[PDB]
Each structure stands twice: as C-alpha cells, then as structure tokens.
C-alpha cells in the first residue's frame, strides 16, 4: 500500500536510517514488512591519472548505491502523519510514490 525506497551510499548508514523509519512506523502505526535489502548499484568510473599521456596509469573509482524497501502494508493516519516532518539524517534519499 505504501512503498518506501530508501537509498544511500554508506551501507552502515542506509540501514541505520531504515532502522528508524521502521522503529517509527512500527510505532505510530504498524504492519510493515521488515527491511528488504535490494540489489546494490555500484557505478565505477575508470580515469587517467597523469596530467599528460601515460594511459596505463589510471585511478579507478566507484560509488555504491544501497537500497531499502520497508513497504508498509497497513497505513495509519497517525503514521502517514508523523511520517512527514521528522526525518533528519543528511545524505539519504526517500521515495514513497507509486
């Protein structure tokens, strides 16, 4: 009924933010479906490190995308409420849309 794709870059921060949305939903509301890991999108970028020529040098970089599902089965006026406003934690993304 209410999906909640929470995504971030640090593994021990994406499921420490989920560890909240849940301890809140399973508070002012209920149901919930426990956290669901989801595949991780690791996007690498291989670049040349020498300011000039020297191709075989290169510095390989990558950004990791961690996901969470949450997925609340039984919404709540009290839960869809406090849901908004309070959220804190800078650096994570939230998406509940359909």
């Amino acid at each position: 009924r209410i999906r909640i794709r929470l995504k971030a870059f640090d593994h021990r921060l994406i499921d420490q933010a989920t560890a909240e949305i849940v301890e809140t939903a399973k508070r002012t509301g209920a149901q919930v479906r426990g956290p669901i890991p989801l595949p991780t999108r690791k996007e690498r970028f291989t670049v040349l490190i020498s300011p000039h020529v020297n191709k075989d040098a290169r510095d390989q970089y990558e950004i990791r995308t961690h996901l969470r599902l949450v997925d609340i089965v039984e919404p709540t006026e009290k839960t869809v409420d406090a849901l908004m406003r309070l959220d804190l934690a800078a650096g994570v993304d939230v998406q509940i849309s359909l």
Partner: protein, 96 residues
C-alpha cells in the same frame, strides 16, 4: 583556459534555449510526414551556436574539452583533485 573559448559555450548555451528548443520545436510534426507546402524547411536561419550538439561540455573549474564526465561535471584531473578529500560524496577507490 582561454576566457574566450569559455564564453563561446556560455553564448552557445544562453542561445540554445532562449531561442532554439523554444522555437526549434519547429521541425517535428511540422517537418515530417504531414501530407508539400514550402513553409517548412525555410525559416532556418537562427543563430548557429544555438544547437543540441553545438557544445563540448567543459570542466566547471578549468575548461578541458576532454576527460569531462557528466556525473561529476568536472574533468578527470580536477575530479581526483576532489576525490581524495571526500569532496565527491560516497566516492572512493574501486576494487574487486
């Protein structure tokens, strides 16, 4: 990196939308299977630099027409410049 070559894109950007795109849409339904009247491919004499390709994308801190990535916007050397100091979020040395 030649203030001039820089402004060349800024003019190709400020001119690509305030004109092209806005009225450049005059080549879709218009310039297609609609039937022919000459009204079409004709009033084609707007700017020049204003184009969806008339650009090279250049580092926001230098202007190196090569090794420029969108995802970060900057150019490889300026990228690493950041990288090694947090600078680019959740970005670190890859390995596997």
């Amino acid at each position: 990196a030649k203030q001039s070559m820089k402004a060349r894109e800024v003019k190709r950007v400020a001119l690509a939308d305030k004109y092209f795109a806005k009225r450049a849409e005059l080549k879709a339904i218009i310039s297609d299977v609609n039937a022919r009247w000459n009204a079409v491919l004709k009033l084609q004499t707007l700017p020049r630099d204003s184009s969806p390709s008339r650009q090279r994308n250049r580092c926001r801190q230098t202007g190196r027409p090569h090794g420029f990535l969108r995802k970060f916007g900057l150019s490889r050397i300026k990228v690493r410049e950041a990288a090694m100091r947090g600078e680019i979020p959740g970005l670190k040395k890859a390995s596997w």
